[PDB]
C-alpha cells in the first residue's frame, strides 16, 4: 500500500565502459516495465569507479552518459529513484560501519580482488579490496529485496547477505534492521552471442570489438559488424533456428526477433527457400539500427540538456538520501552512537 | 589574519577507556592555552571505537563522557571546533576516496593491525585494518598542520602524510589540495610514571590499576594509591629529586610540583631534615586531589546538562562540516566526480 506492496530493487549502473546490445536486450530494455512492477532504485556507482585509476574528465562525462542512458530507456525520476552514488552521503557512512562487521578473510577470498591483486602488484589499493563492503551499504541502505547481479558480482552479493545477517543477529534478532537481499531474476533471458564466435556470450569488456555491438554504436558500424557476423556451414544456406548446429544464424535470428517482434516461426517462413545469408544479414543490421536509433536519439538529446540532468541529479539525490538516512540513523543508534542533535 | 595565521591542530579524542593523570598533565591541562595559540579541532572519534566490539549503551555514554571532559578542561565551542566524528558526514566520505589511494601493503604492515590480527584470529574485521585511512581523512579534511600522536599512532600519521603526498602528486602538483600534517609537539613534557614501578611510564591501558590514577578517579582511591606509591631505599629517607637513583620519589615530586606549583628546589627545602616519606605521600595525595577535584566538579556538572551538551554537539558538527565540506568538494572535483547540483 502501495509501493510498500512491491519488492524494492536496487540496480548499480557503472560510469565506465560501454553497455552492449546484450546488456540492452537482457536488462535495460525491461527497465521501463520493471519501474512499474517494483520499487526501483538506479544508482550510478561513481565511488566504485575510482577503485581503478580514472581520467577525471572521462569519469565526469561517463557519469552523465550513464545517467542519460537510464533516462533514454525510460527510467523516470518521479517513478524510480535515479541518482549518483557520491551525491548521497549515507553510502560512504554506512560503508564504514559495515567494514567493522566484515571479516578480512571474507574480503581476501573474493575472486575479483584476487584477480586485481595479481594484475596491479604492490599498487593494489584498499578500495579495490573493500568495495564489496561499500556495495553492501549501497544495497542495504534502501532495504532492497532484490538486486540484479552479473556472474562477477554474485560473490559480492553473498557477502552483503552475510554482513546483513551478522549485524541483525547482534543488534536486532527479533525485529531485523536490514533486509536480506536476493538476486533479481531478469524477465527476458536474451541470448546475445559474440558476433564472430557465436558459442561465447557477447561481453562488453571483450578486447575483440568485432564481437560486440554497443548501445551507442554508430549505425554504420553496426551494419558492418552484422554483415561480418558468423553464420554456419550449411549448404545450401537455410535460415532456421538451431543453437547447437546453427549457432551463428541462431544469434542473428535472436537479434532480428528482438528488433522486429517477429517469431522464429515467422522468420523461418519469411526466408523460406532463400539459399543465401547475405540479404538476411543486411535485414538484421537494418533492423538492429532501427531498434537502437530511437534510443540513441533520445539519449543524445537528454545527454546535452544539462539543466535537465542537474534537475534529475538533484531530485534523485534528495529522494535517495531521504530513504537512506532512515536506515543510517537506525544503524547508528543500534551500534551505540550518540545521535546528532 | 587571524586564525589563518595560526597553525591548525586536530586532536582525536577516544570515546573509550579512562584518561590518566599522565594524559591530563601531558596534554589536556594545556588545551585551554593551545586553543589560543592554534586553530584547534577536537574530534571525538566514535567511528574508530566500533573497530572493536562495543556495548552500545557504554559507547553512547562514553561519547558524552569524552565531550564533557573536553569542556571541563576548558575547550570552548566558540574558540575551538569540538565535535563527534559520526556527526560530520564528510569523514566517512573522504575516507572512502582515500582508500583508493592507499596500498594494501601499507595497511598490512601497520603494527597496530598486526597485533589485533594475532589476537582476534579470523574475526579480525576490515575496520581495524582500514582505520588508518579514516584517520587520514579525519586530519586532512581540516587541513591540519599539526596532529598530537602517541607512540602507537605515529606510523598511522606517517601513512596520512604518504596518502596526502600521493594524492597531491596526481591531482595538484603545483597547488596542493592537501596539507601535509606533522606531529604536534606538547608544551609540557610531563614525566608521570607508574605508581608501583617508577621506571615505567604511567599507561591508561595498564592492566595493573595500582599503577594508574585516572582523571575521574575517586579522591579516596587517589589518596590510597599515592600512599602505596613506590619511594626508594635511601636511609634515612630524603626527599630530593633524582630520576636514576630516587625514581619513586622523583615521580611523587613531579606530581606534587604539578599540583602545587612548587619547584623541586622549594619541595626539597620544604622537607629538609624530614627523615620519613609518609607525611610527604599524604601531602602529595591531598595535593593531587585538590588539583583534580575542580576539574571533576566541572565535569560532573557539564556531563549531566544534556541540553548544553546537545548545543555543543550541534554547533560543533555544523562548524566542522562547514570546513570539511570545502575539502571534500575539492577532492570530489579533482578525482572527476560530477558535483551534486
Ligand atoms: C560496482 C557495481 C555495484 C556497486 N553497487 C552495486 C549495487 C547493486 C548492483 C551492482 C553494484
Ligand atoms: C583513533 C585515534 C584517532 C583517529 N583520528 C585521529 C586524528 C588525530 C589523532 C588521533 C586520531
Major sheet: arrangement of strands of chain A = 1-2-3
- Number of H- or I-type helical stretches of chain A: 14
Rg value of chain A: 22 Å
- Helix amount of chain A: 40-55%
Percentage beta strand of chain A:
5-15%
Bound molecules: tryptophan
Main CATH class of the largest domain in chain A: Alpha Beta
Overall 3D geometry of chain A? elongated
Annotation, overall tally of beta strands of chain A: 7
Largest interface: A-B, 57 and 57 residues
CATH superfamily of the largest domain in chain A: HUPs
Could you spell the SSE succession of chain A in H and E letters? EHHEHHEHHHHEHEEEHHHHH
The CATH architecture term of the largest domain in chain A is 3-Layer(aba) Sandwich
User: Structural class per helix/strand content of chain A?
Assistant: mainly alpha
CATH topology of the largest domain in chain A: Rossmann fold
Quaternary structure type: homodimer
PDB class: ligase
Keywords: Center for Structural Genomics of Infectious Diseases, Rossmann Fold
Assembly: dimeric
Entry title: Crystal structure of Tryptophanyl-tRNA synthetase from Vibrio cholerae with an endogenous tryptophan
